[PDB]
Design a protein around this ligand. Sequence first.
Ligand code: HEM
Ligand code: HEM
Ligand SMILES: Cc1cc(N)nc(COc2cc(CCN3CCC(F)CC3)cc(F)c2F)c1
Ligand SMILES: Cc1cc(N)nc(COc2cc(CCN3CCC(F)CC3)cc(F)c2F)c1
Ligand SMILES: C[C@H](O)[C@H](O)[C@H]1CNc2nc(N)[nH]c(=O)c2N1
Ligand SMILES: C[C@H](O)[C@H](O)[C@H]1CNc2nc(N)[nH]c(=O)c2N1
Ligand SMILES: [Ca+2]
Ligand SMILES: [Ca+2]
Ligand SMILES: [Cl-]
Ligand SMILES: [Cl-]
Ligand SMILES: [Gd]
Ligand SMILES: [Zn+2]
Lengths: 402, 400
Amino acid sequence: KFPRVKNWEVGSITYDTLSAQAQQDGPCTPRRCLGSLVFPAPEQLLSQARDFINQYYSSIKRSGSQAHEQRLQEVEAEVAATGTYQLRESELVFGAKQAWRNAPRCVGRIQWGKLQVFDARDCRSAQEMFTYICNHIKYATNRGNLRSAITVFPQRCPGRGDFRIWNSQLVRYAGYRQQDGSVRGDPANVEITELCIQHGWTPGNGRFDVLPLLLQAPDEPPELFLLPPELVLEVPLEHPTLEWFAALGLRWYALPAVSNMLLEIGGLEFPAAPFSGWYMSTEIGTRNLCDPHRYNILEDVAVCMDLDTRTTSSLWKDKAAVEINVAVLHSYQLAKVTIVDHHAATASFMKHLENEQKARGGCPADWAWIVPPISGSLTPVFHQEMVNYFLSPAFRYQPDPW
Amino acid sequence: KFPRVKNWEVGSITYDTLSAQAQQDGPCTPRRCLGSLVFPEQLLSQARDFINQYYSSIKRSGSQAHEQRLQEVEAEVAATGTYQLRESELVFGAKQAWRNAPRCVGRIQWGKLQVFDARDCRSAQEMFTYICNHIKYATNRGNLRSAITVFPQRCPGRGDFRIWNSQLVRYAGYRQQDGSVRGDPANVEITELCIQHGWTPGNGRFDVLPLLLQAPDEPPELFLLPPELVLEVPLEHPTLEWFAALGLRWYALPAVSNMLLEIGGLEFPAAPFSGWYMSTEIGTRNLCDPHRYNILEDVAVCMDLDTRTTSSLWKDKAAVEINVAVLHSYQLAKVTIVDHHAATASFMKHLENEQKARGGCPADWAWIVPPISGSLTPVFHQEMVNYFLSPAFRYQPDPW
Ligand code: HEM
Ligand code: HEM
Ligand SMILES: Cc1cc(N)nc(COc2cc(CCN3CCC(F)CC3)cc(F)c2F)c1
Ligand SMILES: Cc1cc(N)nc(COc2cc(CCN3CCC(F)CC3)cc(F)c2F)c1
Ligand SMILES: C[C@H](O)[C@H](O)[C@H]1CNc2nc(N)[nH]c(=O)c2N1
Ligand SMILES: C[C@H](O)[C@H](O)[C@H]1CNc2nc(N)[nH]c(=O)c2N1
Ligand SMILES: [Ca+2]
Ligand SMILES: [Ca+2]
Ligand SMILES: [Cl-]
Ligand SMILES: [Cl-]
Ligand SMILES: [Gd]
Ligand SMILES: [Zn+2]
């Protein structure tokens, strides 16, 4: 049939009929589920192009119209002559919003229809690429009143290299491999930090050194660009009632801007299409600051809190982590930088699921990524069964360009 | 063909070679993953493969004893349509079924399991006696001890032994003409069955239900558990003195009673098992789930938390203190309990042991990761592979 999906908080039941439209296959089989893994041609292009055009003309309630038939005929002829085609500008906007809407691991998809799409398909150099990125960062940051945005650089085409942003995000803190084997700064960024240095970047020695951008124009080594400090909004972390917390000297940046995914629309591939929204506080407070392999501050906050860290049964870890998340939310609200906490984010996502159930009969969702990393069952998505599948247009992971 | 499995905290890689022996099929397809759903004579080949497991396990594979049990079960199935496990095979099967349970974080303990053979049971009155012995043994005055009691297997033409209750110890749930529930909302159905089959309903929030035991082809029989048999822990907080006044309690012994145990093609629809609690089961799920006791906002109000904005994390702060209360109250009463940090660390060790022992371990990430402080535990960062091995515990249709 169709997967029967239950919400255990309410007792309610839906069927995900949308999953039957899934194209690209996932990693699970009847023998074994791999849902927990992080990373698990004209006729095929036309089939994807056709389906996307159908999606576009459905969205504007013009299916089967003359304009619909003619755009299909047009895409066919371009593919027949060139082996590829070009999106109309309207199709690109629609495609990027659909890719977000289709992203199973994104809890912020209530917002998918409110996405500023910057068309950078006529970009020609790394320098111009940097200008686009700075305007993106300026637009999206908006002095702390964050606006979702994506900039789409030229599509992959035969006979020419890709545009690529080497950095995984537009704003990342350096992670300097200390000589012991430890890291100063963000350990997630040791590799890209070493690539920046190797490409001419004079490194700092702080824990919150903003990395430069390594931008790759087609058939070119990456070129290094320093973000103007006034462009990179940061929030000093303090706690509303733990006054020593500010002395920890913690900071995070305003703008989460993923820059290393591939955007796929109607068979066309955009290997450089950085996108940004605003943070959910648990990404900063729990993951970025408390992961053992990230900044790993949990035990130092707990010790400062004078918690009994000798036994796990005191739940000092849970107490310290809550306060770190309180500090993150308080600090962003204090600095007037958009942020959403995980209760509000997951409530909005439940509303997204209900909208998508009526709109499309389902919503691809990756439960382990939608459930926040603290307080899981205190949010409503915990009790919501979810079906994970791949729709297109899509954001996709891609090999690192080096 | 062998799934690569990464630990993101350490960077370590293993390959799950055990998944290739997945006996049955799970709910997932290449088209769509359904891992988050709670409920997704040829009997000879099952029986054969289990016997091979058993003798491989005692390093007697292909031996004379192996070849003899083989032909024995063959002849038994030919004579009777079913066959009987040797007592030791039953012990090995019960332990394996636990060991193969992907959603159980407690499997570091899988080798210590007291198996109680009740296959000689008939009538519900005998069920009740086997069950009180289990309960007394497993409770052990708060020094909790894992156990299973195996009742007679399903066989053709004969009815089934069924414990109608989902656990041996369940709190009642009652409704009123404001729609709400007093007691445990999860037990409204079993509670009205007990009423309909005789039981006199209390009016409390922690009224222990009676047992509805059913022998083959008779109706289920009410049995009341003796009060001195069901060890409960009044919940108090080490520093929030008003917490005691909320009158919260839970019971010592988690004893699942409604799952089907499957061994070498045989099926036991009544084989209750028990361990001890992980504290987040009580403090987070049973007390704080919106459809269970749902006490979170009650506690937050008593903590003078700001419940009118989500961003004060009042739900998170209240939940931690409820779990602290649970841990403190079980320790004070000297009832075995384990916190989610210690439990997930032990499961990591179990994964390492199982990787060496059989090249993998079926694990359902969504159930291994605790419902609070997820990424603060090491299992959050451990990729896992979920598949079905046999012997196994399975869900089964309710007996009505
Ligand atoms: C506006 C507020 C937004 C919020 C609160 C939000 C939140 C999140 C969170 C918490 C995750 C999990 C990431 C992780 O833990 O690694 C995620 C993933 C993701 N987000 Fe959203 N996001 C927002 C905007 C966007 C936008 C504007 C796009 C694209 C246009 C987008 C696309 C994605 C994708 C593709 C992923 C999945 C990456 C992966 O598969 O690992 N998000 N988001
Ligand atoms: C001894 C300490 C034990 C601990 C701390 C423990 C912990 C847990 C937890 C937290 C779950 C998830 C259940 C839920 O949240 O709904 C679970 C499931 C399970 N346990 Fe264990 N358990 C223990 C003993 C046992 C024993 C002795 C058996 C059988 C011999 C067993 C068999 C199972 C099975 C079959 C499940 C899956 C049930 C489901 O799908 O919800 N467990 N356990
Ligand atoms: C727009 C937006 C808003 C918001 N609030 N949050 C996000 C976070 O989006 C992503 C986060 C990550 C984390 C890196 N993750 C670590 C382990 C492995 F290295 C795999 C990569 C990866 C990724 F691909 C993402 F898309 C995005
Ligand atoms: C021995 C032991 C120790 C321990 N510490 N914990 C457990 C908990 O084992 C189980 C928990 C549940 C959750 C119930 N829930 C009801 C609503 C729906 F029907 C889905 C299931 C079901 C179940 F079948 C279990 F086995 C067992
Ligand atoms: C092993 C596991 O899949 C991995 O650590 C995942 C789990 N869920 C997650 N969920 C989110 N939102 N982000 C993550 O990085 C992860 N990590
Ligand atoms: C929808 C979701 O799969 C369901 O609520 C699961 C999630 N993980 C769980 N994990 C545990 N330990 N116990 C549960 O009951 C659940 N419920
Ligand atoms: Ca009324
Ligand atoms: Ca108040
Ligand atoms: Cl991040
Ligand atoms: Cl329980
Ligand atoms: Gd203070
Ligand atoms: Zn799956």
